[PDB]
Amino acid sequence: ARGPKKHLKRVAAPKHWMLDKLTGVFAPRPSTGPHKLRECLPLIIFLRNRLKYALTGDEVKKICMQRFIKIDGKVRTDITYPAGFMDVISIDKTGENFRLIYDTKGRFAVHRITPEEAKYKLCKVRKIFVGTKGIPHLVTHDARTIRYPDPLIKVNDTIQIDLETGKITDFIKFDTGNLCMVTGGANLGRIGVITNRERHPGSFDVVHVKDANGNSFATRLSNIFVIGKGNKPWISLPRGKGIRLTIAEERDKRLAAKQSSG
Template identity: 70%
Template sequence: MPQSIGCWTNLVVLLHPNHLLDPTNPGSAWLLAVDSYYAQQAEIRPTLLVLWMLFLFRRPMRISACSMITKGRFRLHSVRDEEAKFKLCKVRSIQFGKKGIPYLNTYDGRTIRYPDPLIKANDTIKFDLETNKIVDFIKFDVGNVVMVTGGRNRGRVGVIKNREKHKGSFETIHVQDAAGHEFATRLSNVFTIGKGTKPWVSLPKGKGIKLSIIEEARKRLAAQSAAPA
């Protein structure tokens, strides 16, 4: 067990059953720790699932991505082949290196040199996983569709209606979902996923619309009554 993981990770490892450890290397229990930047990107890299499929089928297997639902939990979500070729990454910062070479940092740990000068912090880039290049980007502007990746509204999807700036404090983003419900969250919790009202990635079941307890109960009753006896 590496010593640099920290006490919190050690506790997580102790609370997990042994059958969830890496089957190819049982001593590598630290694989259960999920990097924080995957939570920022509303994605979790399912390392254990990949290793289990490699162990069972003895060959590499490609699996679907993980998406966050309105309950704040992650759920496996199937994607098309075209969608599996790229990834949306939120820009953390734009900086200059030696000899004035510009580069950007993303929340999933990537460093890309010579980005488009129009790309700024909090924007979203479309990163091609085959060529390792930026093919397009989304500005963090009013009117674009976003997904909330943190806070009490995580998992919800909507369109930016307003940006409320406070000097010396957090910037608040007001979002409206497809059902007309409005809510507010911090700027750090918002991740742009498309231009206008059309997202660039497929959404999980529910399309990021959070239902009230009464609406969920009515939906379950309607599904039960419609089901054949």
Template identity: 70%
Template structure:
């Protein structure tokens, strides 16, 4: 009697015979081959049906597996806060608890973060959020009315999330990259932005990879900037993450990834995929304020000299 695999363990010859007998199949007789084939088919059906199942959503995140852009220290515990499902991907977001506890130092523990957000003190894109693991992402505006502070999430030139302080006037709008444009039900055109917004009846001149300026109080598009040569962009992915510059030209590769060449203010060029480019303004003038350094990446020697000059003052 051949051995059968049941789940993760093998059944012996006698166990296989008992299992076939329980199914009402006799392992002997002239039709042995046909019986064995039927037994195998039924066995595989039952095994696959019972052992390959959905395990449900993952609810934990190890600290070593967390994105490096969160800048968590290795010895700070075994786990990190796992972001809730939301407008940004897990690898491209910053949970609200890390913003309040690790960056702003407004809380010492996760319990204190919960107490803060449950008081409805934190707004993200002009909407109160009470989920301590809500995923905030690039260009999101975080408002703390009690302290009168406004922050916009940006990247530094090393690819880490940066909480850039902005004015109350600038906190009324944000830039969003257009990811998709389609026709919906009854031929209604709509676009989808990088933060999951769906906006109906956009301007027909808006295309994929353009950036739209959204009024956060009315949730409407007030202006847009085209993805074209000469406009200011920031790299939001790849090894040039956080660098800013002006588009020089775009290489088109049919069946592959289009490559965009960008030149910064120091006349240094770098190239990245078109999916990693976010348009920030018309010409060389940004529509949002840039963080310290203006997206210019320095070499190790230049960083050393800059620190020495600052220390000498």
């Protein structure tokens, strides 16, 4: 093709959007932005498919153009704006705050947070570099650049950003024994304590993680997002606490819940 593509076929859309197949030919192509195309949830999918606040894309536009939707503390009127991991969505008209947080199935849950929690977000620092006559700079997964970070902050650490001012207020190092979520791969959405990091120079480091129920998995280092110091998260977690039940336990839990009614 010549130049960039502007459309997204509904069936080539990320499967975690949980789009059906008969609504249309196209899926809302996420706009360029802080998060990657396949690692984001567009505002239209959140406000229409997840929250059911709108029935069509026209109503999503009508909501967004009234400036009711804030993403990370800023009003966004782009209905395909890419909202991704850790992003805080505030709807002040209805007085509700959400944080885009993965499910254990790898999907962005509708996770409501308190207005006090909506003041900050965790960000995994993607790189640290010196520029502009010795000024240290830090780049996060959110793609926000921060000048003058703490000298102890390194790549793969997690910082806490106050959304009102956008400066670092705390940080967790990437250490063994720290709680972390998985943001990609087969184990996407799982939460556990980092056990050990096997280093492969010139290749991908593998991080082993142990669930709160004792289940051990492993991912690439690029898929690890440190959540809290020790085993205590710095953010609220969804109803499932990052523990991925097998299909047998899911079936048993569903049957127990169904048999408890009636």
